[PDB]
Symmetry: C3
């Protein structure tokens, strides 16, 4: 719990109402009860703010006239919401202290206040920084290093020789450092290319659940600082992702792709490899990226949904578009 | 477990034609069935082939009966009868039996009657496991989560904190329920984490495949209705709502705050945008690119399917330049008129 | 790990030019290579750059040799030689060594010689592990499953019951082999589970990436042939059959009862529908949408690639209205034909 006056101070918001109100948590506008602080971004929710039963509402100045409760005025309600939710976070830690069922190699190097959950497995030579938390059931492979403040939820797999920076967060089911998909071909038989590169993850990286990030073949797969990656993504060997880029759910990236800084890769996109995407590119969901992207801006692909009866005709016509083109050229020639 | 044919026929509400004392030991395909096996025929084209099936009994319709070359179980719906008899004769093991000494179970967890927990599973404080719940080896169940009676998790399932799972659910290995939704605010180009303090509510009789991820909500909850079936490798984002009885095939990727109605069918590898609604009784065919709300029931499709590469090159180049083609058509139309 | 250059050259069937007594400690990229490293050159545009490479030896072709600024191993196939020398000098650790005290192993399991089982792995009753099999930490191997000699599972792999895996396979972490196929009957709108009592049969020398799922069959079996390579995040549905030496890149989804032949190459993020067959020696390029059987070898493709969003908006609008474009074209043809 926190006093509304103290919360507004920490949030650099200006308070309009009883600063002695006690805030115990954050809630949506529709669910907020007494003690909750909430927020609004869309002006449509103005007309019925009197129906919201939160103790306080984070809003802008243009919103204040419509307020029907204590209000914290800020320039950016959504960012203030992020900050106040961190202050009022109820999320537990993946582990507390080192569990007696954890299996930790005697050559592991552990900092202070490291927590390791039940049945986690820590291999030889692993370095865990101060305040690192390893969840139940994780595996951390030989000589990997995890920087101070980083946290793995339950059942994360880190392979060997992996480097992870400070204050990262990796959700369950994710695998960092599996072999890249590298094979030579000897007369039709695949010949494995050992993948002896690594994965380097920077600081403040968040990776979702059941995402896979392969190690490089010789040099490294690199995730920049401040990158956020959603669930179900595949980051192939020797991919390089620039700082602060965001990758939404289910994105598949091929080997040796380079993505710049401040990019936004939409859900379920497919990005081919051995090419570069420049800074400040947005690919919208399901984008089929076949060529380098050299200019910033928003890019898209795909023919959207239609009723099935309509789609049948659309697809058949598109598949015969060469014949349509030939007929147009012939008609131009004749006219 | 072996069963007399007459008893199996009674449990299936089938009409027995043949020796009720035949002992059935399992279910098999028509081509693999041997003595002791029961099988089924759904396709009357195989009537002439039944003499090649070595099953001790065959489930079939009344129209099929004159063609039988074995004891027959006559039913109205051979396919449904097959599902029922396979359940009766199921050889699938349980994920665990009893409580393994290597499992780590917080003292405050509440176990119902006849709960089984497999080797090296981890059960956090405040967890409640209903009667007959089975947790597979190596699972994690997070703080205060509740799993209803008869639900079963295979090995290596991850349930986060404050998750509610109904009765008689089944969750395959590698699945993660309740990870953080993809919630971040942007501050001058830096991403600022939004704690995801909502939950996941999973209803009764829900089946979830392997390596599927269902994220918790930001403030309110991600909700999966009763009787929903979800295949492998699906992504259900934070604050998605999936209505009762909907089926989601493999590899479907859903964005945040999507609401899918009841009785929908979402084909494999579809991609569904967020902050929008799909009404009841909608079918999206495979690889559907769902970018806008769907407000009428029925069948919807997208995608330009495969062609020989030489042909595809022309299709793709012409589509990409279709604006020029459209302009040329208009210009030719004006010249002719 | 260290090996004299002359000995390495002999094991590679390479021709040594330079000091055979050089001690090679590992493999590196041309850009990263330092003393003790061996590297390779596949692209002759780097001949002028070899003086910037500080490897102790470089694998190259006879045509490259005049450009060398180091000991050289001359071979016909630098890329294949690299694969072989990377295997000889492999630094990849094993998933486990010996049998960990924290592993839980059913008394009825049968182990071959020199089996290793990692910490907190769980082995069910009736499992058979062949000689030199390695089971990583935290794995689960379900009842009666059999893993052939030399096969290795990395950490946190799940093998269900009644699964058969061949020799010298390799499965990366997070993968699930033998989960229930997506099988349901329907009773008045209620899904009725169909127990999936078939199996998965995986052949010899199969490599499977991370977080891939391969479901068991409904009655008969899901089958992966010998020498198949499957990348990460793939989905192989119940009763799929994949022929020998086929490669499947990352994120491919295959629906039930698909049959893929031998020597196929399935590009990343492709979607392959089921109850159909793809013949031998078919290449599906990335993101391919396969709706019909493929009966002739060769290369097949689908998809409309990326455009700037403002351009894409117009493209999508025109395509969605392509039927009207077709009707206008036919009408203009009748006019030009004087009808
Ligand atoms: C990173 C952020 C804070 C902001 C953001 O821009 C974003 C976010 N979540 C998304 N989910 N999906 C998605 C998921 C599944 C299917 C389809 C789409 C996107 O495409 C998402 C995007 C993007 C839009 C355009 C480029 S990235 C949250
Ligand atoms: C649930 C059910 C008993 C019936 C059903 O409706 C269904 C089933 N299995 C499927 N597999 N795939 C699939 C998987 C991967 C790639 C491509 C396709 C579908 O699209 C499937 C569908 C659906 C078709 C259209 C909408 S849902 C079995
Ligand atoms: C097996 C091999 C040594 C050779 C090979 O053929 C191949 C390889 N890696 C790939 N990655 N991706 C990919 C991954 C993610 C997104 C987009 C593309 C492909 O499509 C790949 C392919 C293929 C190309 C065409 C058919 S298979 C490595
Ligand atoms: Mg243990
Ligand atoms: Mg996908």
């Amino acid at each position: 719990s926190i006093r509304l006056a103290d919360l507004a101070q920490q949030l650099d918001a200006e308070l309009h109402g009883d600063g002695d109100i006690v805030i115990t948590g954050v809630a949506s506008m529709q669910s907020a009860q007494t003690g909750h602080i909430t927020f609004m971004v869309n002006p449509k929710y103005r007309e019925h703010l009197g129906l919201c039963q939160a103790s306080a509402v984070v809003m802008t100045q243009d919103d204040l006239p419509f307020a029907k409760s204590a209000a914290l005025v800020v320039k950016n309600p959504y960012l203030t919401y992020a900050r106040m939710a961190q202050i009022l976070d109820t999320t537990p830690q993946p582990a507390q202290n080192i569990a007696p069922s954890a299996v930790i190699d005697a050559t592991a190097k552990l900092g202070n206040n490291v927590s390791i959950g039940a049945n986690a497995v820590i291999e030889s030579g692993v370095e865990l920084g101060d305040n690192v938390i390893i969840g139940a059931g994780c595996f951390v492979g030989k000589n990997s290093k995890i920087g101070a403040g980083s946290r793995l939820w339950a059942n994360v797999t880190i392979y060997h020789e992996i480097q992870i920076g400070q204050n990262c967060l990796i959700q369950s089911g994710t695998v960092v450092g599996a072999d890249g998909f590298g094979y030579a071909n000897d007369r039709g038989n695949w010949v494995k290319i050992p993948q002896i590169g690594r994965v380097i993850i920077g600081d403040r990286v968040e990776i979702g659940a059941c995402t896979t990030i392969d190690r490089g073949a010789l040099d490294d797969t690199i995730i920049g600082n401040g990158v956020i990656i959603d669930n179900q993504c595949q980051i192939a060997h020797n991919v390089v992702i620039g700082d602060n880029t965001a990758v939404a759910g289910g994105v598949i990236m091929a080997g040796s792709l380079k993505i710049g800084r401040y990019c936004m890769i939409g859900g379920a996109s497919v990005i081919n490899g051995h090419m570069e995407i420049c800074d400040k590119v947005t690919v919208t969901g399901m984008g089929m990226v076949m060529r380098p992207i050299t200019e910033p801006g928003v890019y898209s692909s795909g023919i959207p949904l239609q009723p099935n009866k309509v789609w049948r005709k659309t697809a058949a016509l598109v598949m015969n578009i060469d014949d349509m083109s030939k007929r147009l050229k012939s008609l131009e020639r004749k006219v």
